[PDB]
Design a protein around this ligand. Structure first.
Ligand SMILES: [Mg+2]
Ligand SMILES: [Mg+2]
Ligand SMILES: [Mg+2]
Ligand SMILES: [Mg+2]
Ligand SMILES: [Mg+2]
Ligand SMILES: [Mg+2]
Ligand SMILES: [Mg+2]
Ligand SMILES: [Mg+2]
Ligand SMILES: [Mg+2]
Ligand SMILES: [Mg+2]
Ligand SMILES: [Mg+2]
Ligand SMILES: [Mg+2]
Ligand SMILES: [Mg+2]
Ligand SMILES: [Mg+2]
Ligand SMILES: [Mg+2]
Ligand SMILES: [Mg+2]
Ligand SMILES: [Zn+2]
Lengths: 53, 216, 120, 114, 122
RNA sequence: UUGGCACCUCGAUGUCGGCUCAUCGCAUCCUGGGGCUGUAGUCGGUCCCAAGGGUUGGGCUGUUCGCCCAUUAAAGCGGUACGCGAGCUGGGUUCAGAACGUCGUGAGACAGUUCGGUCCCUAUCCGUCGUGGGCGUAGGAAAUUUGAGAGGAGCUGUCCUUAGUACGAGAGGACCGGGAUGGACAUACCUCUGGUGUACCAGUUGUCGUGCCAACGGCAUAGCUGGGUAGCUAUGUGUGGACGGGAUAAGUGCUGAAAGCAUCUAAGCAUGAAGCCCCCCUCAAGAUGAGAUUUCCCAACUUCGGUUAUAAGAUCCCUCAAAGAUGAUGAGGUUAAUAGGUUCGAGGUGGAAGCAUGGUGACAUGUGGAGCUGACGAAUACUAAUCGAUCGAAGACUUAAU
């Protein structure tokens, strides 16, 4: 099976409405103040849950 | 006509008065309370709303459905009850025989009562036509390239379309199912359990609704 | 239990390797799913070590790998000996929970959630 | 255990007058035939080839050779239909399920006694 | 569980030794028969001199099955073999003797003469 | 149907039969309701209403047909590109090989036969089956709901009794009514019977290892073999099509004139089908006509139109399963039993290792229902669900009544 008609610019962009990524789930590291992934070690300072890793 | 809510515990068996083996489902139906009374005057129809299985009290930073939120806590407190996990209406009962805040004990039913039991059937996820709709396979040999496919979906130019209701792969189970004319084998008031003859829909821990059988 | 994208024999082999490496090094970097599986394996091994009897040593031998650990004092001991010596002694008074997992974030090559699993 | 509620509600179904026995033991099972209004005891004697399940659900199976034809009877261990069970002989076997006897006849099928 | 093409031993002295099932009686689309059910069958093997001959199309009642039967009390009975008895229109056996044990369900089927002739009824 | 015509398609509209999946008509095969009968009864014949449901396995043949075997209440007739090959097959048939009969001088040929002979395609659109997000539904929310509409279901045997009665010389043998129990189908479910059960237990071969013994590991389909938990399951276990109401069809009538009689019909009034509308089951307010009930939140600042972060609430992220392709759903996130671990069990396996004893030994016995044990039950914060962040109201106008 093959496309019977080409896809308009309009139809293509409608289809891509939901094709996107989200901002990561991130919060400020309470130790060093730099952003980190929630529930992950902070890579800037190596800290997690008030302790060094 | 009577009604109660319980959780499906699991199946077992009991020996009857003649030694016949009776398969049973154990339903734990503790902590049923009449939360609201609906009437033709206020609501347009008669029914009792029953709440089942106390959940925990409201707390500030609640993160799960274990803790009642403020709307639910107010609703239950109006009945003077603790907030409840499951809330369902029974239209088949006589509203005048119940008071808001009243307990509905398993003793409302008696052994021999014929009942209808309603639950949500077990989910099966995405399933094909053979399993979901019970269709026949194609040949497994003799050169076949048709084993579990759903088969023809229409005819030809007439009608150049697939009719609504065509049976196709999709999500299976997880549907409301009523089993009619089961029987109350036993009522154990100490344990707050009803032994129902036979099997009922849903996984273990699933919510089940027991009503007096509509057909009589 | 997870399958970890491997056949039964390959999965068993990988879990023995991971558990032995964790016993040896006391903390390893690996993927999240692998760590969540090996925590159970390792803690069952710790339980055997704490039991300490000969039957338990042989049951542990079924799982551990044959690896030599060179101690600071130029002395050597097997992973099994380390398990039934210092690790078991360490966790005598602890009832379960001999491992912890610390999520690190996706790695570059395939986006796998890198984690650290360590003893204690 | 099994679920506490299941055990609690089925506890009174359990019988306490049954002798201990194992697969490979030869049993005489006295069974109440309640045909019509007359009741009589028919004895089924044979080797226990199977015991399975738990609580009120537990069952056992006994095998006999009748007129040259093998016959297997499976009972709920706690059925009131059984008047009593007698352990006629203790067998020496090496596994829980003696399905291999189904394929054996005569001296080949004999169970050593303990 | 007896179906078309199932072969069965004949548990009698009618002359038929082995039958092949042609039909399970008792409704359209009925797939399987068990103890106490009647089948149409053909005699594939026969004893020289018997009343029933090879190639006869006859009716038989199933008296033993490997599948067995379940009883209202939750007990079961199963046999090592599938066996049937050739019958007349009045449910009486074509032969005069029955061999091997038979299930008690035949009584509820009203095959009283077969039950009486059986050496054992279980 | 056999044809006639040659109007679409020869820069391709795949052709018989079968398989899978159906769907529609009714000129009805069964079942339901009726009139007539050369209808005694049991059976039938013929015609009318009726499309709700149902309407079988095999032998032969490529076959469709058809004959046959055995059933069944019945084994309906037709349309849908003689429904369905981007769903399957490819036996027939119209490519290349070969052969027979036959025709032909021959090359070759034959709606004659025979053996053999490549069935491609990752679905863009509509359509269909599932599953999410947006906005709307004049504040923001949590639950519970009405049911406009829509979908599902809808079949039938046999036996007992009435009653060996009515009817009939006899043979035979009922209606109506009351019970029991099946076939097929549908649906839920795993207590039972069984299947599977690749991180459960055990036996065992070959070979390579862990130095050796003993004990174990790797590989040989999970090496093979005997069992087997949960889950998933049918052939297993429960349940359903019950009882009814309203209006009708063919019919059957009452009263009744037109037409002093007659007349079911014109007015009027009854009765009458498995069919129609309900009763039963499921979905359902995007029902933009966006419905209803209960409960929750409710202030400051304003260029005074309005705004604001916050409230109730919900999420991100995280631990998960009864849920699941992913979203979604549901159980939980320390004021915590959500999972892992740990402890105790269930079920499974069936007698661990070590040691002792008896044997020359293979082995046997005891210690000891031992040891082990994924998913199932209970308990326990030991580990991980940290610290955090985001979103989310202030309620338009008109009129009437108050
Ligand atoms: Mg098929
Ligand atoms: Mg294939
Ligand atoms: Mg292997
Ligand atoms: Mg073209
Ligand atoms: Mg008609
Ligand atoms: Mg043949
Ligand atoms: Mg066609
Ligand atoms: Mg096509
Ligand atoms: Mg061909
Ligand atoms: Mg040629
Ligand atoms: Mg010539
Ligand atoms: Mg099961
Ligand atoms: Mg089970
Ligand atoms: Mg090697
Ligand atoms: Mg050795
Ligand atoms: Mg090799
Ligand atoms: Zn930091």
């Amino acid at each position: 099976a093959v496309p019977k008609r080409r896809t308009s610019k309009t139809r293509k962009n409608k289809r891509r409405t939901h094709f996107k990524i989200s901002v990561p789930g991130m919060t400020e590291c309470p130790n060093c103040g730099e952003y980190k992934l929630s529930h992950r070690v902070c890579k800037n300072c190596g800290s997690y849950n008030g302790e060094e890793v | 006509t009577k009604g109660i809510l319980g959780r499906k515990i699991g199946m077992t068996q009991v020996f009857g008065e003649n030694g016949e083996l009776i398969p049973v489902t154990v339903v734990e139906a503790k902590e049923n309370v009449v939360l609201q009374k609906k009437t033709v005057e206020v609501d347009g129809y008669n029914a009792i709303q029953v709440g089942f299985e106390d959940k925990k009290a409201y707390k500030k930073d609640a993160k799960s459905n274990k803790y009642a939120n403020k709307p639910a806590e107010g609703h239950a407190k109006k009945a003077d009850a603790a907030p409840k996990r499951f809330i369902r209406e029974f239209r088949n009962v006589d509203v005048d025989a119940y008071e808001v805040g009243q307990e509905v004990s398993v003793d409302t039913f008696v052994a021999g009562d014929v009942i209808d039991v309603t639950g949500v059937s077990k989910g099966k996820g995405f399933q094909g036509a053979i399993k979901r709709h019970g269709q026949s396979r194609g040949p497994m040999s003799h050169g076949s390239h048709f084993h579990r496919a759903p088969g023809s979906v229409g005819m030809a130019s007439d009608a150049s379309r697939v009719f609504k209701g065509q049976k196709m792969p999709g999500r299976m189970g997880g549907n409301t199912v009523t089993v009619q004319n089961l029987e109350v084998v036993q009522v154990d008031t100490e344990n707050k359990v009803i032994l129902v003859k036979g099997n009922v829909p849903g996984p273990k821990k699933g919510l089940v609704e027991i009503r007096t059988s509509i057909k009589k | 239990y997870r399958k970890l994208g491997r056949t039964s024999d390959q999965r068993k082999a990988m879990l023995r390797d991971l558990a032995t490496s964790l016993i040896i090094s006391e903390r390893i970097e690996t993927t999240e799913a692998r760590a969540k599986e090996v925590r159970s394996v390792v803690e069952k091994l710790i339980t055997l070590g704490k039991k300490g009897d000969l039957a338990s040593r042989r049951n542990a031998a079924k799982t551990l790998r044959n690896v030599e650990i060179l101690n600071e004092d130029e002395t050597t001991q097997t992973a099994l000996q380390k398990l039934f010596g210092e690790i078991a002694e360490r966790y005598t008074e602890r009832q379960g929970g001999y491992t912890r997992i610390l999520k690190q974030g996706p790695r570059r090559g395939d986006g796998a959630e890198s984690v650290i699993i360590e003893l204690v | 255990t099994n679920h506490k509620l299941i055990e609690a509600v089925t506890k009174s179904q359990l019988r306490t007058d049954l002798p201990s026995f194992r697969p490979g033991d030869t049993l005489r099972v006295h069974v109440r035939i309640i045909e019509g209004t007359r009741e009589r005891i028919q004895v089924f004697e044979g080797v226990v080839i199977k015991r399975r399940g738990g609580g009120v659900s537990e069952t056992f199976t006994v095998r006999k050779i009748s007129s040259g034809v093998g016959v297997e009877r499976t009972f709920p261990l706690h059925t009131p239909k059984i008047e009593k069970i007698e352990v006629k002989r203790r067998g020496k076997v090496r596994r829980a399920k003696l399905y291999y006897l189904r394929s054996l006849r005569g001296k080949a099928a004999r169970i050593q006694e303990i | 569980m007896i179906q078309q093409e199932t072969r069965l031993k004949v548990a009698d002295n009618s002359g038929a030794r082995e039958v092949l099932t042609i039909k399970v009686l008792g409704g359209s689309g009925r797939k399987t028969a068990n103890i106490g059910d009647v089948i149409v069958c053909t005699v594939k093997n026969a004893t020289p001199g018997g009343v029933v001959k090879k190639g006869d199309v006859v009716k038989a009642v199933i008296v033993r099955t490997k599948s067995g039967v379940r009883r209202n009390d939750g007990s079961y009975i199963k046999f090592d073999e599938n066996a049937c008895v050739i019958i007349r229109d009045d449910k009486g056996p074509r032969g005069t003797r029955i061999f091997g044990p038979v299930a008690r369900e035949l009584r509820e089927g009203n095959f009283m003469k077969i039950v009486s002739l059986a050496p054992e009824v279980l």
